Swiss-Prot record, chain A:
Protein name (database record): Transient receptor potential cation channel subfamily M member 2
Gene designation per UniProt: TRPM2
Motif (Selectivity filter): 448-451
Free-text comment about domains: Contains two binding sites for ADP-ribose, one in the N-terminal part of the channel and the other in the C-terminal nudix hydrolase domain. Both sites seem to have a role in channel opening, but the interaction of ADP-ribose with the N-terminal site is absolutely required for channel activation.
Residues of the full protein shown: 532 to 1150 of 1503
Outcome of swapping residue 454 to A: No change in the reversal potential. No change in the ion selectivity to Ca(2+) over Na(+)
Primary subcellular site in the record, as a coarse category: membrane
Effect of residue 515 to A: Decreases in sensitivity to PIP2
Membrane topology, Extracellular segments: 286-296, 358-365, 420-439
Organism, scientific name: Homo sapiens
Length: 588, 234, 89
């Protein structure tokens, strides 16, 4: 880290962003390299912009009144920033200075009086996991892997203390802005540090089942929630009851309707049904209604898919802050499932024009058939829902990310067979353009065991052997590699990668509960609820989709004093099992 | 099978109904020690196969129409339209690319042969290997003991049966149901091999078991003291 | 039976070793250890959410192991009375 800062001191020298001078070590230089050690956070504890601009304080440029130098609060200019006393939180800053000097136990003592009882332990867990991966090269990077899991285990016992007594305040605890760590809502940090044991801690799974509902609680079954989806008067029977209806507060059928829209699953179960029906009518229009003029069904096949282009666009409106454009798209083209979302619209650009240009109507059916496969990829990506379902789709991520050459390895291995089999005889089911087809397509349809009986229906020992020779390293080279590629995903499978499914579960549920309940044929009306709102307004401040928690300051002090009181209530408990360790007693 | 208007489902439905007896047939023939545990392995398989049915039923459908998207064939009449476009194109997963039928960028389906072949074997037949990796624990040593656990669970179910065959069990029902009209209240010979306990029989027994319990009480603390980790704690 | 009831009150207060002392004078030599094994296996699965539910999984297997050595004592000497022992009301 000190070798980084002297590099950061010449990643920002005198010239580029500190125009008077910067050869010497400053706070924002540490904060900018602490900014790369965070991700989707805000910028806490170390204020960066013009009200605490610690970038140019070496050469004389004037004080507060002109704003070009310093902090514009401290009315004296003496080549520093004055006594900006305890800038946000002193003890949260000593958590940094021990870990960037790799002080192991003393930061745990700083943890013992750290006001952030919970997310600071993840902050000592996250960057130390990066510093595991970045550079120590041996003997400490492996150690700070084993230290970050205890630093994660530091954060677990904090939730043990708070959830077992007054869990209602602990229900809020995973939603605070907290004014401390770039608010990050305590899950967006927990989803970033990958936290394989922490997010799978117990009452969190009891808590994310209360995020799993609202006014739509348990004693509803999976078989009877679909019966109330399509049948609207069936919801008014002795079947599914709201929390309002449990308290007898449904006095309005619109209140029976509008609370039904706000489910995490009712939006999703419409994407179960109404999206999959587009895939079935796709075959119906392709087998029957392939007509180059726009028909009534050809006008109907556009009403869903262009709106689905707007769905990912609407997801792209939910992505950024109020300042970022290109970086949030740069994160979108890094995720592999979002890389696969390109081609599903891309061949619809090419194949539909082929479906409309009369000269290329055969690729109008061929390309869009291949384009259906690209929706099938997302179809598995969207139907990987339940607990038995989920993890093995991720098993065929690390399969399929490793299959990307096993495509081409297959595409190497097949080619040496069919010409070589037809090297025995160049057959006769053949015309002028079936020359290039019969020598290839009949000879390379043969890997479904389909040695072409369509066609016919001196050392002959060789191909008798050569039957098995290709058969050998089909099964040896490609189908033991079936077994071998399984032997990369072989770790913590039932016990902890199933917990990794619960980790990526609420990662997706916040993506898919964070959607408007209008269907894609009715979401352009919801776009018109927002885009011509922009012409009767000026600046974006409308109803944004967020279920966060706003924190009153007197509300915090009633809470955070109790969590710190719970932290000292846990502080005797963590050292107790250290003393109750019998290996400590023989060390004693 | 009795309505003349539906005699084709009289053979079709009962053929599918034979499979449902075949399920219980494996459930009743899972008898011996080498036999038993792997039927329970294909419980946690088969309980997890319940979507791998539908996952298969998702994955097959995108092939046969797409293969016949190259050409809509001619072994076809007015009702073999809906059959030939479907049933000949979806009989093909026993490698049975329909040689019954026939017997410009042609590089594509040469590739697309392998593309479907890939994620048959990758998506469904590594999931063969993956679904095996849920039943991977204490297999020879202790799930074989779980077979012995569920063994006498079933033997008390199946020794607890009358020895009359099912053609002669209605006589054994008539041994019990018209016994109910010459009696009033059910107190007849119920199937149970229990043990009735005389109170003087208990006190001769239970005092000795408690005497065996104090005879064991020194023995359980002894290996706690004979634990060498206790002695370094001492 | 008083001592069979103190087996409940220690486990529902999660008193680990003191119930084993109550086991040491428990008249039910065998099935009471399964009774401390069964509900504690449910209380493993029902609600402790961490750090004790996993522990009472590891406690119920020793509580099961408590019940094993009872059958070790009775079957090795006069197994004919121990043959009845798995059939008592
Ligand atoms: Ca997306």
């Amino acid at each position: 880290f000190h070798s980084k800062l002297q590099k950061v001191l010449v990643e920002d020298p005198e010239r580029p962003a500190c125009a008077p001078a910067a050869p010497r070590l400053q706070m924002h230089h540490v904060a900018q390299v602490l900014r790369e050690l965070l991700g989707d956070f805000t910028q806490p504890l170390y204020p960066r912009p013009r009200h605490n601009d610690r970038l140019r304080l070496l050469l004389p440029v004037p004080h507060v009144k002109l704003n070009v130098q310093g902090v514009s609060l401290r009315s004296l200019y003496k080549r520093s920033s004055g006594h900006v006393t305890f800038t946000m939180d002193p003890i949260r800053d000593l958590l940094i200075w021990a870990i960037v000097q790799n002080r192991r136990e003393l930061a745990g003592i700083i943890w013992a009086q750290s006001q952030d009882c919970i997310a600071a332990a993840l902050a000592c867990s996250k960057i130390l996991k990066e510093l595991s991966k970045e550079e120590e090269d041996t003997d400490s990077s492996e150690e700070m892997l084993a230290l970050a899991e205890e630093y994660e285990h530091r954060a677990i016992g904090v939730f043990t203390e708070c959830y077992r007594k007054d869990e209602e305040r602990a229900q809020k605890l995973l939603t605070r802005v907290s004014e401390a760590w770039g608010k990050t809502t305590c899950l967006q940090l927990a989803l970033e540090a990958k936290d394989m044991k922490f997010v799978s801690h117990g009452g969190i799974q009891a808590f994310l089942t209360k995020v799993w509902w609202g006014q739509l609680s348990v004693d509803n079954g999976l078989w009877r929630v679909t019966l109330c989806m399509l049948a609207f008067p069936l919801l008014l029977t002795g079947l599914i009851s709201f929390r309002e209806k449990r308290l007898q507060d449904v006095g309005t059928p619109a209140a029976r309707a509008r609370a039904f829209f706000t489910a995490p699953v009712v939006v999703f179960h419409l994407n179960i049904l109404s999206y999959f029906a587009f895939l079935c009518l796709f075959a119906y229009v392709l087998m029957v209604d392939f007509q180059p003029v726009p028909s009534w069904c050809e006008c109907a096949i556009y009403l869903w898919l262009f709106s689905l282009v707007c769905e990912e666009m609407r997801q792209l409106f939910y992505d950024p802050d109020e300042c970022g454009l290109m970086k949030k798209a740069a994160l979108y083209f890094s995720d592999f499932w979002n890389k696969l979302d390109v081609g599903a619209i891309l061949l619809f650009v090419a194949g539909l024009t082929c479906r409309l240009i009369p000269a290329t109507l055969y690729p109008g059916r061929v390309i869009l058939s291949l384009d259906f496969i690209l929706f099938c990829l997302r179809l598995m990506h969207i139907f990987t829902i339940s607990k038995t379902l989920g993890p093995k789709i991720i098993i065929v991520k690390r399969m399929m990310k490793d299959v990307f050459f096993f495509l081409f390895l297959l595409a190497v291995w097949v080619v040496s067979f069919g010409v070589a089999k037809q090297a025995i005889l160049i057959h006769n089911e053949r015309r002028v353009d079936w020359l290039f087809r019969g020598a290839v397509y009949h000879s390379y349809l043969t890997i479904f065991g389909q040695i072409p009986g369509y066609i016919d229906g001196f050392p002959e020992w060789l191909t008798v052997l050569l039957l098995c020779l290709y058969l050998l390293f089909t099964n040896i080279l490609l189908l033991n590699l079936l077994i071998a590629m399984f032997n990369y995903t072989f770790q913590q499978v039932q016990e902890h990668t199933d917990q990794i499914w619960k980790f990526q579960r609420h990662d997706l549920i916040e993506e898919y509960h964070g959607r408007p309940a209008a269907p894609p044929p009715f979401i352009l009306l919801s776009h018109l609820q927002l885009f011509i709102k922009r012409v009767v307004l000026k600046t974006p401040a409308k109803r944004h989709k967020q279920l966060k928690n706003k924190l009153e300051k007197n509300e915090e002090a009633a809470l955070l004093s109790w969590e710190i009181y719970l932290k000292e209530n846990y502080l005797q408990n963590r050292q107790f099992q250290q003393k109750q360790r019998p290996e400590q007693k023989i060390e004693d």
